[PDB]
Design a protein around this ligand. Structure first.
Ligand SMILES: Nc1nc2c(ncn2[C@@H]2O[C@H](COP(=O)(O)OP(=O)(O)O)[C@@H](O)[C@H]2O)c(=O)[nH]1
Ligand SMILES: [Cl-]
Lengths: 186, 187
């Protein structure tokens, strides 16, 4: 239900110009198309998009860090800026990390998890495009990814789910998990 | 060698009692990072220790943070005092941050880098106890630490090396790097 109430609020061009939100969660990932599809499924030139949730809380969609998702000449700088945002954004209470289920935990995915890990805040992973895998492959990939992330449990509660925008699969768990973060924070 | 034959000068427990040194560099790190061993290796030898370098300037050894044996309130007090020193010490020209190569860049390491970042001064990282990692693990850790520190390069010259007190690995680069800071200060 939490994401169904989201309303687009404002777009900002530079992290330097972020508004002072009460509380926010961030969506990050390699692929703009996969991340946009997930957000569209959850809510029914890429820039920084703020969506208003209930009670003055916010979700922030940040430009993807994969090839071509921002111009290649500035992508290294963007990775550093986004990494610094994860490390330092004081009102960021949780991270939604979107990764293609066929190719999870690429180097930049892990770098973003490392940038965020010192916060001790929770991460929820959507293994997107789950419909591209057989059901047995989906189950195996989910367990493999969870096992690979166990070292982050020294500081963080990491949760992982399969997600499909095409099949509308996984909406309830995403709402439940992110909802619990704001309930805890409020 | 910048650090060779450095001599102990004084020990202070309060920032009010700091000597009015001409120029200094500071050593910081988490408790059990290997900072005392690294200083002994470099020099061939809670409170703040001042050492006089042969060049007449000073090296400042600040007590390790995150020491699990002492109460949370004492740890927090020293985090605040360290941040005060790093942010405000006018004659501090560079920072040597020592981190256990097996577990680098913990939250308190980030906190110290953040305290010092507003100075624009250089930071040199020693990834210590490197001998406890395989050669490939040492290189991979070098790579990951350098990637995670790139955001600080917007305002500071950040350099990183592997270091082993036990195997006397990394001494030359540590001397050359910190020495260059004193050269640039002109004296
Ligand atoms: N293998 C190895 N052990 C080290 C090295 N430097 C320090 N140690 C060990 O790490 C522990 C903590 O070292 P110490 O210098 O006292 O750390 P400090 O608390 O940061 O001053 C000690 O047991 C040392 O024996 C090193 O280069 N290699
Ligand atoms: Cl940490």
């Amino acid at each position: 239900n939490l994401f169904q109430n989201a309303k687009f609020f404002t777009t900002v061009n530079h992290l330097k110009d972020l508004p002072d939100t009460p509380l926010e969660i961030a969506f990050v990932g390699r692929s703009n198309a996969g991340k946009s599809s997930a957000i569209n499924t959850l809510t029914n030139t890429q820039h920084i998009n703020f969506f208003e949730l209930q009670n003055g809380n916010f979700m922030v969609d940040l430009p993807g860090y994969g090839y071509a998702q921002v111009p290649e000449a500035v992508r290294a700088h963007w990775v550093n800026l986004l990494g610094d945002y994860l490390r330092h954004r004081k009102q960021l209470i949780g991270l939604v990390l979107i990764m293609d289920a066929r190719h999870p935990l690429k180097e930049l995915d892990i770098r973003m998890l490392d940038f965020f890990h010192t916060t001790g805040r929770p991460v929820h992973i959507l293994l997107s495009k789950a419909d591209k895998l057989s059901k047995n492959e989906q189950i195996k990939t989910l367990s493999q990814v969870k096992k690979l992330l166990k070292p982050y449990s020294d500081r963080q509660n990491i949760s992982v789910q399969l997600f499909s925008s095409l099949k509308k699969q996984g909406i309830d768990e995403a709402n439940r998990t992110v909802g619990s973060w704001f309930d805890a924070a409020d």
